[PDB]
Structures are given as C-alpha cells and as structure tokens.
C-alpha cells in the first residue's frame, strides 16, 4: 500500500519519516543549521559596508569576451575580503580605493565553460552617495 | 508583579462595561468591597457611561463629594465603589432609585425602582456556619454577614434584607419549581423555572432551567439565584423579562417597531 504505513495509530512513524526526509531539501538544511550566521560573508543580512582595497580587471572569456570591472573590498563588520561587481561605470570614475561602499546581493550565475565568474555582489553606494544618481548625474560625489 | 496591582488597562476591562477602546488608555479599577472585581460595576461607570450625568471623570468626583449617591441606604464617596447585582442606588436630589439587574444581553441596565421596592434587597446565601460563642450566621452574595437566621435557612437560599435595619425579613429555600435568575456564564440574564437539580458529588452541580417560552438550558449551581414564584417575583423585573430571543425574532421586532 504505497510503501508507507496507513494504520490509524501510526502518526509517530509518519512524522519521524518527515523529519528525516526534510534534511534532503536545500533551504531547510541551510536554514536550521545556521549556515548564513556562520560562513556567508554578509552574515545573513541584505546589505553591507566595506572599504575598497583594490580595483580589479577580471576577465570573462567564453563565449562572451568582456573585461569585468570589479572591486576587492574588506568588510567593516567582519574583517572579510570580498570581491564585488560595480555596474554602469566604464571608468569607475566614481570609485577610488580606500572608500566606503554599500554592497548588496547580485544574482549572476557565471559559467564553467570559459571560466567566466559571476561574483555575488553589486555596488549600491560609494562614499554615502547613490551610485545610480552619480551615473545618471543627479548628485555630485565628495571625493574623500 | 512584586505586590498587589493598582491599575486596569482599558482592553483588560470586563466587556460588559461597554467602554470604548479609544477614549483613553485605562479603565477604573474597582476597589475592594462587596463584589467581585470581574462582575462589579464601579460608580464612575454608572454615573458617566450609563446615566450621562457626568461628562468627565472629575464630575463624578464632584457629585460623589456632595453625598447625593446612596448605595444600599449608605452614602458612598468612592469613585470606583463596586456596586453589583441586586444593589440599590438612590439619587435624592434627582429622586430616583435603581436596582442593578442584568439585561438579557448580560450587562447591567438602568432600572427604575419605587420607594417601597428600594427599601429591601435580595441575597443568595453563600455560606451558613456557627461562629464564636455558638451563634449561627449567614453570609450572602454581597458579603453581608447576618447573625441569628431562621434555622431552616440552608445554603443557596435567597434571603430578603430590609435595608433600614439590615435584618432578615423572610426567605425562599432552594426548591424545584421556583423562579430563578441566572448569575454567571453564557446564559446570563435569563429568567426561568428550575426543572430539577442534577447532583455530581465531588465536582460541580448542574441545574436545568426552563424559561417562560419552554426553552431549556443548563447552568452550574454557582450561577443560580432564586427570586420568587411562578409569575410572582419578589422584585420588579426589567423589560424583556429575561427571555432569550433568536436574532431573526429581534430583527423582525425592530422593523416592526418602525411604521413612521
């Protein structure tokens, strides 16, 4: 009878079977082990601030050849070194080194076929300033 | 809590006070006295919320500090004095009298009383016992302790008390086929005749009551109060006569009292 017990005094076997088989999910296992509270670089938050250590010319080769513009940051809350993408600025003229940056998440899945990376994070603010309004020229950036 | 409380928040009020939930932030916590906290009615609510005589809180204080309001013959000066069931409220300068009787919906209602009816007061005997130097006494539903009763008075008997002297005038013993008002619980405010007494020793007793329209309901023994006989109540009953109506009957009555 469908390989599972159907007796009317068998609720215990059913719920122990569910608690054993829910560890095969992905979100459950990340969620009840405290994965984000231990090893994820944001520590389970939606944003983070950090200090720019480097500007990086990452390369995406195949099948799209592009020069990815990234930034190696050291986060303030953790002491954690994270590279992150910065959009829409070909010059990175709003970014210098040793500036403070508000980062968010970024869902690009890079490919394995040509060693192209998808870094996990985008730049939202530099030096307190909205990077969008910089690139759309609605504010000016204080340069320290 | 590190000691006894002194406040009562406005959501934690008994719902049968009909207090609005956005007037202020609290409700008047009733004092210690003749009635239970949960089922009392303090004087501030009866002056302001139901008789509309006082607009503010301090107008209640101004009226009560002029000794107009008597609760069961005596003048009270407390804002939150627990006036409860079967009690007599007397306004001399207004020349009005009120008996606190539950409505059919389970809340206290305004109820005008003649001077002859205002002289007495009923009370359910809650314990009879033999106190010091061997004197018997009864203790009623409001806390009144009366020495030297009739020996036929047992527990649950309703006793008539004349408010002038505070003596036992006469009484009714708890017999089947008597007129009974209901004090607590879901069926609160109904007037009926008890069919019989169901008895569970070691636990809670139960009472089957049958109303004027032959509906039958069941309460515990705690929620029972005896008034009188069939068609002979010792007090004057409010309008509606403790008769529980269905919602359709009430709706039809409301639109039948609308004929321009």
């Amino acid at each position: 009878g469908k390989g599972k017990p159907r007796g009317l005094n068998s609720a215990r076997k059913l719920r122990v079977h569910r608690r054993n088989n829910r560890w095969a999910e992905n979100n459950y296992k990340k969620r009840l082990l405290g994965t984000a509270f231990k090893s994820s670089p944001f520590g389970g938050s939606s944003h983070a601030k950090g200090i720019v250590l480097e500007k990086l010319g990452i390369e995406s080769k195949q099948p799209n050849s592009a020069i990815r513009k990234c930034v190696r940051v050291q986060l303030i809350k953790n002491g954690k070194k994270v590279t992150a993408f910065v959009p829409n600025d070909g010059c990175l003229n709003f970014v210098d080194e040793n500036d403070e940056v508000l980062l968010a998440g970024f869902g690009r899945k890079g490919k394995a076929k040509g060693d192209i990376p998808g870094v996990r994070f985008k730049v939202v603010k530099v030096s307190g300033v909205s990077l969008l309004a910089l690139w759309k020229e609605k504010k000016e950036k204080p340069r320290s | 809590a590190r000691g006894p409380k002194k406040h009562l928040k406005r959501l934690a009020a008994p719902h049968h006070w009909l207090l609005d939930k956005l007037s202020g932030c609290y409700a008047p916590r009733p004092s210690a006295g003749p009635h239970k906290l949960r089922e009392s009615l303090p004087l501030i609510v009866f002056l302001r919320n139901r008789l509309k005589y006082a607009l503010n809180g301090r107008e209640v204080k101004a009226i009560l500090m002029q000794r107009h309001v008597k609760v069961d013959g005596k003048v009270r000066t407390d804002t939150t004095y627990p006036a409860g069931f079967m009690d007599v409220i007397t306004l001399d300068a207004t020349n009005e009298n009120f008996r606190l009787v539950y409505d059919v919906k389970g809340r206290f209602a305004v109820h005008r009383i003649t001077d002859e009816e205002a002289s007495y007061k009923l009370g359910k005997v809650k314990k009879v016992q033999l106190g010091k130097k061997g004197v018997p006494y009864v203790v009623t539903h409001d806390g009144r302790t009366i020495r030297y009763p009739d020996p036929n008075i047992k527990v649950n008997d309703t006793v008539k008390i004349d408010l002038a002297s505070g003596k036992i005038t006469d009484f009714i013993k708890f017999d089947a086929g008597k007129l009974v008002y209901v004090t607590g619980g879901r069926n609160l405010g109904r007037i009926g005749t008890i069919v019989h007494k169901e008895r569970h020793d070691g636990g809670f007793d139960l009472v089957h009551i049958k109303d004027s329209l032959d509906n039958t309901f069941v309460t515990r023994l705690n929620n029972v109060f005896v008034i009188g006989e069939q068609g002979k109540p010792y007090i004057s009953l409010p309008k509606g006569k403790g008769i529980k109506l269905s919602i359709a009957e009430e709706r039809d009555r409301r639109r039948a009292q609308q004929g321009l």
């Binding site: - | 956005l22 932030c25 359709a248």
Partner: protein
C-alpha cells in the same frame, strides 16, 4: 500602549501583470466610466471577491438554517439598497452572476452623468470634485460615493454652488469687475 488601531487594504494586485485581454477590458471599463487608476478597478474586484466568498460559503449550508437565512437576507437587502442587485434577483444564486459593471454603474461618478446633470462622464467627475453637487443637503465630492437607491431622487446642485444658487464664482465676478472698470475707464 493603546488599542492598536485597525485598518485594511482595499484593492488587490492581479496575479499576472501582462495579459492583453485583461488590459483591454480594464481600459474599456476606464473609458466607459472615467477612472484614473487600475486600482480603482481592483477595489471593485476585491469587494466583489469578498461578496462572492460570503455567498459561496453560505451556499454550502443547507436551507432552513438560521445562519444562512439571516446573513443571506442581510446581504441581499444590503445589495438591493444600493441598486446593484435588482428586485427580481433576491436570491443567493443571482449574486454570483452579479458583475463589476453593476457596481460601477451605481457611482455618484456615473449617476451624475446618467441623470443628465453633466455633459460628460469626465465632466461629471469634474462637477463632483469642484463641490457643485449635493445629495439632499450634504455636499459630496468623492466620486466613489456609491449612490444608494433611495438617494437617487436627491442629487442636484448645491445652494453654495453658482450653478445651483449663490453668487457667481471667482473668474465670473473677476471678469464682471474688469468689464465694469473698463466701462468706467
């Protein structure tokens, strides 16, 4: 620490955002009735949804039940009072064939145009919001007033408004003052 004051939402976001037949039907409704938002349609959809849920969960109960007859008569009578449900259709079955246009026709928005007090539906909303229209004696300037049936023989102009009463407005007497000064000049 008080009573946490209650509130609710009133519109409902549709499930799929781009759906050509739905966009066309909504815009036909807006054109026939002079709306401004899709939210003004979603409000009527949400109210009709709650009414249909009340209906179809009272239908599962058997008849001659006091809850069904009670709440059904309350619902049906309340719909008849606003003229959304007609006189013959006073059953629970006909409130489920009751559609959005039946609600949307009963607006003050619509009833000003339909009584011949405005030239356009857009002109009807304009005369509403510029405080020109009274129901009995009280002036209403919300187009979503949802005229109850008995209130139909009271919609007119206001005694405040120049169309219905007292002195002509700002531009009118301004131009009259310029005419009188220029005739004096």
């Amino acid at each position: 620490p008080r009573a946490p004051r209650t509130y609710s939402k009133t519109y409902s976001t549709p499930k799929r955002p781009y759906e050509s037949s739905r966009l066309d039907a909504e815009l036909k409704l807006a054109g026939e009735f002079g709306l401004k938002n899709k939210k003004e349609i979603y409000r009527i959809s949400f109210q009709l949804s709650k009414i249909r849920r009340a209906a179809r969960d009272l239908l599962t109960r058997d008849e001659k039940d006091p809850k069904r007859l009670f709440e059904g008569n309350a619902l049906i009578r309340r719909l008849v009072r606003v003229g959304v449900l007609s006189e013959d259709k006073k059953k629970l079955d006909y409130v489920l064939a009751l559609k959005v246009e039946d609600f949307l026709e009963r607006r003050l928005q619509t009833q000003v145009y339909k009584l011949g007090l405005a030239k356009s539906v857009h002109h009807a909303r304009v005369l509403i919001t510029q405080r020109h229209i009274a129901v009995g004696k009280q002036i209403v300037n919300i187009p979503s007033f949802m005229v109850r049936l008995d209130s139909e023989k009271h919609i007119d102009f206001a005694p405040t408004s120049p169309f219905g009463g007292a002195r002509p407005g700002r531009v009118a007497r301004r131009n009259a003052a310029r005419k009188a000064e220029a005739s004096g000049e």
